[PDB]
Write a protein that binds this ligand. Structure first.
Ligand code: B12
Lengths: 453, 252, 453, 453
């Protein structure tokens, strides 16, 4: 392989695959912080070209963290279909980009082809895509999963109801649930980040979520986003099991930071199978986001886009119902502004769909980042055109407890009615019977939580 | 005439023709979340959008504001800082916020008590209001707690521009068995005074991972009251010493 | 008339309607340059609220340039339906915003209501709208016109073929036309910006455009975007008349700068009626964009958003076939970066549609602006979802004589196939018969200009 | 637990659950042979009632072979969703029957409910079902899987191409493939039962099947139905992997007879994931049939219907692409005549669908059974109405090496055109492009294998 190109008469040399992968990234603050970014636009383009000219084999055989050193690498490499790999191994990344984008490439063509990829190869493709490339490419790669609702069907758009409270107050959680449902949010999941990581509290929060679900016979699932171990314990002790959640990181060291062993995710699937109130076969829920590996000092010189792709490779092994990046959840040190947050959201979603996972996005920003709510509204709509499986919903997007701004309940209704998209069909039926939705559109009586009383 | 920052603006019900308007007020009372603001089509109502924008403008200011050097001194606190020199650099360089500057290390060994059982550290972190508003309410009872029916309490000090991981270095330098950090978490849209406690048993820069820490979050008058939180942190400290473990390695 | 509010205990007072209009704007470099911007985020929000509580009558009665001193103000004011105005005059701008966004407000409701507005009122609504508001509001305000193609029908999406050349070389122009057509671009217009503004050259360029149109029986129209007077002269002397173009400004002073009189647009209308090869009733084409008035010294202390709206009040008088803002045509001094250019694009389009004109957007940027092609791709897709009537098309978006980057021919096909939108129905039929399009999608043989040979 | 009832004044007592399960069966030769059948029609009806009044808990807690003694029992029991079981455990088998048949019970309702069942409970439901019950019940329980084709979608009907030869002669195999395809058979799988169980021969047969698949770009999959171990070995050594097959039995003793370990099916799954040319997530293929356990001495006093259900509990663990009973494959000693073979076919299919597997049927009989081709045609049509996922196809149904009669290629085309059912959607598209199918119907040129030459 070549680690070198000549651009405008000048030679641009790179040390290894890892460097090419990193410097090919569109400019972001995290790459600069990691020390791995290109020095200029010229070096960035040179990196893109070098990368585009590398084969699938070049990138597959050079994972950013070595096989013997990393259990995530091992999991990713060991999940490769070697027959599918052998077919494409001599393709250039340029050819793979064009293949993904081609109108003559079907969903079924990609279904086999993606099995010959690794996360690094998935990342490589994203790095040489424009914003429209990422959107169009992602759109023609639907990924459909099923819990008590079906998610990811083209022409549909789902949303997580995120009814968080500063004290896990059940009346406050309930109030937000009723508000979200009145806007048609919650077909992805009704999922709460709890304040206290504790079995009594987890059960109480789950009891509250499922009290509403059972009262109104809602086709959906509940979730409490505590550490996976405590969810499992709660469910084993008799709490209602819907989706089981874990935040993940794309390296072994990153997982250790999060306190996660792969064995826990195996156990999560086994507990789901024994206990969980789920009709379909998918019941896991992962969250991800650029910068997490870097924060953990667990990127090993790799850029945050490659590391995020490795999250999806790990996630794919467990065939989850839903995954979302939390695109601007952390701060400006990893993604500084509107431009960077949008780009990362498009990258993350594209990479997830290429990896064959049920990819959504928490379109979000923090108050110490160079961003505002118009960014969330920009990105949510772009990703919706990309076939994003789901976003979050909170009242006006104001998380009173996680201290950031996500998308409003309003925004899911806006997206759906703007683009003629429906909820999950199971959830849509329920909304119709409740008188909340008619023909994909909020009725007059919708958006009013008192409807449930 | 309405001030978007007023209690009336915060209590505004916006739902147009309510199915049950008494339920709405009861719902609005039950949460600090921006429920019951209604809609115009699928979009937010104007007043709701305006108050959102007003709160954001004020939120942005809280990330940039810094506690006077005089206030830290007036609390009787030693002020030390990280490698960060200013607020702008703090936001973009977490790796420097996780490390004491050269003079900070020396000042700790000089001025703090060596080898304490429980070391209390305070830092502005991402929210100055989280420190200033809550300080007098959490610190006294916490110190009095670790002393009363207690043990070898360290001397409390303020770290400017601190990130959570800095407590590992602080633990090694002072030889502390338990290190308690009280730090400002990132400001919310409509709140800035949310404090968190990150505590760890016998930390080491080279081996300590984040899961080794126990977190107590959302400390404030709208979450867990500072006074009530102080007694939790004391009991947490006792348990850490008894078990010789913290974070995910603790029992129950 | 309140010109004051209290925000967080702080009293915010403004001098007049104009200062309220200016400071209510989202931050942009043009406003700071004009000295009209807010001094802080709080003042911006205070300005927004004060504006929100002002009535339609307050804004209508206080245009940024006086009636007796400005012919554009006169044209705008004299075009008001006073019965429609009387119905809404006591509405707050807040109520008007909620009215426009309401799903209970029909297209026909807005059809009458908008006749009671002036451009300043149109601007005021946009100033207190979020990005999603601007997009969803615009989408539910379709504006449909007809030349030889029908543009603006919901579910469709058109494109100007912009085949510009450094020397007006007819072989270069033709090359880009055949390229544009092969991607399905050209249903809005085939429009050349000439380097030389004379009759002989105009006629030769028109001959080239219409040579292609006539050989393949293309349902579309041609245009050469010289000064109005040269277009008219060329057409009177026998050159094929398609659309007649003029760039406009929102003040009398600005029109003078441009060298245009209102009488010329009157003559253009009449010349169209006598000479032009147009089946439908619309044949005029205007371009606009934020900053032009400020550049001309013709903004009279008014912000560039309010002045831009006044362009649409002007344009609406002449019922053009198409209007587009040229959103980032000038430089960073008026719109600095991605964020500001997107916001402007959304504003311009919303205001255009609210004004009842056939509003499109040249999604573009310059090389001395803080922007790149990914911005163009972001904005074109967002605007497409807003029901933007048309964008530009050039080979990869590179204009070789106007020195800026607009959207690629690729981008229109991407948008259509991404969002399931069709071309103008007349043009779509032609594309189907050429074998270039099937069911809204580029056929295998599309994207190849040699198909015409 | 009642093991007794009074019928016409006569007291009928049974010893245990197993005897109740056995005697509740409709009369068949296998049960009499096993010594487990009723002694009279009255006793059968008494057994049915006693069974009807037993609970899910009664049957679940009393499997026909003990947990500690039987690994299949363990696999079945350890796969139970205990939350689902807890909801239904106190339901009578009568109530469960009415539940399954109710039009108020949705597919998603059954999706969760079935996870609370064991195979014995599945059997119990079938035993108190009439023929129309079995058919209508099965129809409202669709099971959908995906290899390179999607099978099981309501409104579709698939077929295995079974091109068997006496000497595994590749020219004979290919002849029957071209014949099958020309009738639209082969969307389930192209699967050969080899006469010689060795790697070289397996690879040569696979080469022949995949020679055809590859030349015509057929969306389907190949399979050679040797022992699991030889399939794996062949595929590891480079032979094209499609579906991986194994015949199964409902007891540990029976698996031993067959020479299979559960570990082999684990390995087959992993070998599929590394090697196999499959776009979808399902790649295993099991065959089953009433009598096999009894033949193996491995029924442990249990009737052949209950044992057959246990096959589906086994199969479900491995989420196969397809399963079919081979209904009358063995002889009259287990199913004697038309009536018994039809009843068995309906039972097997219903139980398969209730167990949540992709259930088809080889509608067949032997020449020493009291049966003929008209029986095959009766059963294939009845099962088609039940939503049977697939049947076999051979030239006129004559298998020249397995010595029995299955369904003709004609029979699948007959069923599809009779009932307005389509092939697998991917395969249908291929047939349309080959000119073999139009609107679900064989074209004039269909039914002619020389079309491929
Ligand atoms: C931002 C954030 C994160 C980021 C941290 C990365 C970063 N910031 O660089 C990401 C997105 C990576 C993250 C991940 C997780 N987080 Co977190 N996080 C937050 C959040 C919103 C802000 C924390 C903050 O502002 N810290 C102040 C600043 C100054 O500290 P910092 O040095 O800049 O950042 C450090 C801490 O944020 C720390 N951290 C972040 N989350 C957590 C969680 C735990 C248990 C610990 C020990 C440390 C920790 O990581 C950084 C160390 O360099 C809080 C909510 C809140 N209102 O505080 C939740 C919160 C602290 N996180 C929570 C949880 C549970 C998690 C996860 C365990 C999720 C899961 N279910 O698996 C993971 C694993 C965390 C880990 N072990 O590393 C809980 C803690 C529950 C508890 N009482 O123990 C909180 C309170 C949210 C909630 N559920 O209510 N999180």
């Amino acid at each position: 392989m070549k680690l070198k190109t000549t651009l405008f008469g000048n030679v641009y040399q790179f040390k290894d695959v890892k460097e090419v992968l990193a410097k090919a990234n569109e400019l972001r603050s995290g790459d600069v912080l990691a020390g791995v970014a290109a020095a200029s636009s010229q070096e960035r383009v040179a990196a893109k070209q070098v990368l585009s000219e590398m084969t699938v084999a070049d990138i597959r055989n050079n994972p950013v963290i070595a096989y013997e050193d990393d259990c995530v690498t091992r999991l990713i490499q060991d999940d490769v279909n070697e027959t599918a790999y052998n077919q494409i191994k001599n393709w250039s990344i340029s050819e793979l980009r064009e293949y993904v984008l081609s109108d003559e490439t079907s969903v079924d063509d990609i279904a086999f082809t993606r099995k010959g990829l690794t996360s690094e190869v998935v990342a490589a493709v994203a790095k040489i895509c424009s914003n429209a490339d990422l959107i169009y490419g992602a759109k023609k790669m639907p990924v459909i999963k099923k819990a008590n609702t079906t998610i990811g069907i083209p022409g549909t758009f789902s949303a997580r109801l995120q009814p968080n409270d500063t004290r896990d107050d059940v009346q406050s959680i309930a109030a937000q649930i009723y508000e979200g449902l009145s806007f048609g949010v919650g077909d992805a999941v009704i999922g709460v980040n709890p304040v206290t990581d504790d079995v009594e509290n987890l059960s109480r929060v789950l009891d509250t979520i499922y009290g509403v679900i059972d009262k109104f016979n809602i086709p959906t699932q509940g979730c409490v986003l505590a550490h996976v171990t405590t969810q499992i314990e709660a469910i084993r002790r008799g709490a209602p099991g819907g989706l089981i959640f874990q935040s993940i990181c794309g390296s072994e060291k990153g997982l250790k930071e999060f306190g996660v062993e792969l064995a826990m995710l195996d156990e999560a699937r086994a507990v789901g199978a024994e206990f969980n109130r789920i009709a379909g076969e998918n019941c896991l829920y992962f969250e991800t986001g650029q910068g997490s590996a870097l924060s953990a000092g667990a990127n090993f010189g790799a850029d945050q886009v490659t590391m995020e792709a490795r999250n999806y490779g790990l996630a794919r092994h467990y065939d989850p119902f839903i995954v979302n990046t939390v695109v601007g959840f952390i701060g400006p040190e990893y993604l500084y502004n509107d431009r960077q947050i949008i780009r990362a959201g498009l990258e993350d979603h594209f990479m997830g769909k290429l990896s064959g996972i049920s990819m959504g996005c928490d379109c979000c920003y923090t108050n110490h980042a160079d961003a505002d709510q118009n960014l969330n509204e920009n990105l949510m709509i772009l990703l919706a055109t990309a076939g994003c499986n789901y976003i979050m919903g909170m009242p006006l997007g104001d998380d009173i407890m996680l201290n950031y701004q996500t998308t409003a309940f309003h925004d899911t209704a806006t997206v759906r009615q703007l683009l003629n998209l429906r909820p999950s069909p199971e959830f849509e039926r329920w909304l119709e019977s409740m008188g909340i939705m008619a023909n994909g559109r909020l009725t007059k009586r919708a958006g009013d939580p008192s409807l449930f009383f | 005439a309405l001030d978007l920052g007023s209690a009336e603006a915060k209590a505004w019900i916006g739902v147009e023709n309510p199915h049950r308007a008494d339920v709405l007020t009861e719902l609005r009372r039950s949460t600090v979340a921006r429920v019951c603001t209604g809609r115009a089509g699928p979009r937010p109502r104007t007043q709701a959008l305006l108050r959102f924008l007003a709160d954001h403008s004020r939120s942005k200011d809280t990330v940039l504001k810094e506690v006077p050097e005089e206030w830290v001194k007036a609390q009787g606190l030693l002020e030390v800082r990280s490698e960060i020199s200013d607020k702008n650099l703090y936001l973009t360089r977490p790796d420097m916020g996780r490390r004491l500057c050269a003079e900070a290390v020396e000042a700790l060994k000089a001025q703090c008590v060596a080898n304490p059982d429980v070391q209390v550290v305070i830092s502005d972190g991402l929210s100055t209001d989280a420190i200033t508003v809550n300080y007098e309410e959490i610190l006294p009872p916490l110190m009095a707690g670790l002393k009363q029916a207690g043990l070898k309490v360290g001397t409390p000090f303020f770290v400017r521009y601190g990130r959570v991981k800095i407590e590992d270095q602080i633990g090694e330098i002072l030889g502390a068995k338990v290190v308690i950090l009280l730090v400002g978490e990132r400001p919310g849209l409509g709140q800035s005074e949310s404090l968190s406690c990150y505590a760890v048993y016998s930390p080491r820069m080279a081996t300590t991972v984040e899961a080794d820490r126990t977190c107590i979050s959302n400390i404030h008058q709208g979450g867990t009251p500072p006074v009530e939180a102080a007694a939790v942190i004391v009991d947490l400290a006792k348990r850490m010493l008894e078990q010789k473990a913290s974070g995910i390695n603790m029992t129950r």
